[PDB]
């Protein structure tokens, strides 16, 4: 779900 | 009844490898009466592009969130995972996986407080802080709870100057600020307007780092 | 002067050069804040003046009642005893950046959004949030402090320790069980007495308990989810  | 009764539940990661049975406390918790929402959080609010017209109202509960009193997002640990960073805008609480299962073991609903992970990592400040939530006053449903949040950018007026592959993820941090109880704006360029802080991607004007400093820190960080 | 019932204690830095400790000291005194060079202790009895055997949990000392805010500096979360002692007593652990903040606005702000995490726990491999009792700008530290019912409030304790050199350490985790609200009682052995759990130090205890037994981990563990993590 992306990590940023 | 079910344990889990009105209880929303959304789950992240894991973060790190085999750190818990997200698949296996899914179901416990179905199989507890508890709902399980496989994309997050978002299902309880409008969605504000809908109609992206006018342009854009902050977010408010979707009348289905009446049904529930609780929500929960299960997570080893913070991350900034999109369902994590929509549980932070919305204040909903991130809670480590043990939570349920001491839920189990008291067949109740137990205070998640011991649970709680922190919020995030500050590069701002260089440190991890903790997660602040207006406590469940177990006699508002979550839309009555959701509806009553005033942001912590409630008010703020913001201009993002940006549909398609990156627009999505452009699109994500409008959707926090949102959550964040701010009022946000979308034009292709600034001109004359009227605004309280502008967002551009990448790097007045800030980029969408500022959005989950503000996220993390449940702050407007600008002030 | 904006600090002006404010009492501060400094941890750190955590991390080499985080902040300016002796800078920010100086910012607080001279701004009316107290600050308290060797942590919180002093708002609290001396459980160990005392007495001994089995010892009451902490009280605030009178003079806390001059007082109605009180925190811990840190650049970070960390086991630094002062930050234990914090955590102990439900006093925010609020990063530096508070500070300067506060000069900002003129006025004491609300630290929430500089409360550092509790820390990291082993137990569940990961790093909690404090929970902080707010702030109610009528009641003194003292009038706080002494309403405050620790989260191993009633728990009663037995420590088996066989007050010099290492039992310096050993007694600051009977402070800590004491500031969680538990009544300590220290013995050399355990026997045939009542408790809720034991308190040795790394492992030992034969000897039917019955209780059980556990390390200063567990306090620690304690310490940061803010919870009797035995229940
Ligand atoms: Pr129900
Ligand atoms: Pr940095
Ligand atoms: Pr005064
Ligand atoms: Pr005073």
Known sequence: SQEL | ?223
């Open chain 2, 1 to 223: 009844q079910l344990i889990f009764d009105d209880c929303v539940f959304a789950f992240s990661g894991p973060v790190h490898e085999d750190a818990y049975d997200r698949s296996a406390l899914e179901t416990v918790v179905q199989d507890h009466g508890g709902l399980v929402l496989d994309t997050g959080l978002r299902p309880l609010f409008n969605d504000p592009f809908k109609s992206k017209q006018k342009k854009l109202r902050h977010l408010k509960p979707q009348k289905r969130s009446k049904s529930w009193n609780q929500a929960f997002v299960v997570s080893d640990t913070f991350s900034r995972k999109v369902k994590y960073l929509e549980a932070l805008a919305f204040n909903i609480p991130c809670v480590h996986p043990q939570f349920i299962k001491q839920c189990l073991k008291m067949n109740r609903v137990v205070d998640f407080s011991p649970y709680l992970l922190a919020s995030g990592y500050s590069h701002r400040l260089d440190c991890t802080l903790s997660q602040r939530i207006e406590p469940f006053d177990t006699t508002d449903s979550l839309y009555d709870r959701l509806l009553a949040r005033k942001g912590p950018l409630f008010g703020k007026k913001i201009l993002f100057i940006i549909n398609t592959e990156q627009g999505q993820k452009a699109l994500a941090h409008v959707y926090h600020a949102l959550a964040l109880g701010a009022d946000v704006e979308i034009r292709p360029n600034v001109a004359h307007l009227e605004c309280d802080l502008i967002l551009t991607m990448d790097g007045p004007v800030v980029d969408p780092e500022w959005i989950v400093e503000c996220l993390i820190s449940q702050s407007d960080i600008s002030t």
